[PDB]
Design a protein around this ligand. Structure first.
Ligand SMILES: [Cl-]
Length: 199
């Protein structure tokens, strides 16, 4: 599918759970805690950029936040937890400015999904886009889906029709792409993520 739309104002759910990194996307699941790709977290640790809470073209800014620590998923899956320091250098509270997206606990082939992130973020001044498609394949912690994606979509949450989190985009076939790959969250991955949410 190639069906995309700018989210001009990302202050409402679930858009206010999406975060921009300098080169990718993530999603907020709990206190100070973002899920993204392992590769996005790692690249961001070279340049040590802050995370921008739900950056969009219009609407009140949610703050930029310093990265506190990273927990990489031990296995092969391109998955990592990024923790942020809660208070920005302007006094904004990370938690007051995002939502915590709940888990879908799986999906089925043929389900209609959305991928929300920052395709070509550096060139667009980090406009948020939602792109719609379908899940075409699921196997263990892998899924394939046909929502249009571009570089900058890494780490993008893949949401079901009730805005619940199925997994995150990590790679494609292109770059630039209509056959994309995600990390699909099984119970074991949901457990790793939930054990790494700040208390
Ligand atoms: Cl605040």
């Amino acid at each position: 599918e190639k069906n995309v739309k700018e989210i001009t104002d990302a202050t409402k759910e679930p858009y206010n759970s999406v975060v921009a990194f300098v080169g990718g996307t993530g999603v907020v699941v709990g206190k100070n805690t973002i899920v993204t790709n392992k590769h996005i977290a790692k690249s961001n640790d070279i340049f040590k950029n802050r995370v921008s809470a739900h950056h969009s073209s219009k609407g009140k800014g949610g703050g930029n936040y310093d990265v506190k620590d990273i927990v990489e998923y031990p296995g092969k899956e391109d998955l990592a937890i990024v923790h942020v320091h809660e208070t920005s250098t302007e006094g904004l509270n990370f938690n007051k400015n995002v939502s915590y997206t709940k888990f879908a606990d799986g999906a089925k082939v043929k389900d209609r999904i959305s991928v929300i992130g920052y395709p070509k973020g550096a060139q667009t001044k980090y406009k948020m886009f939602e792109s719609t498609g379908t899940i075409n394949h699921i196997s263990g912690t892998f899924m394939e889906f046909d929502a249009y994606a571009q570089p900058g979509n890494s780490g993008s949450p893949v949401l079901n029709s009730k805005h619940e989190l199925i997994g995150i985009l990590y790679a494609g076939s292109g770059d630039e792409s209509e056959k994309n790959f995600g990390v699909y969250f099984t119970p074991q991955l949901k457990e790793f993520i939930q054990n790494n949410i700040e208390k």
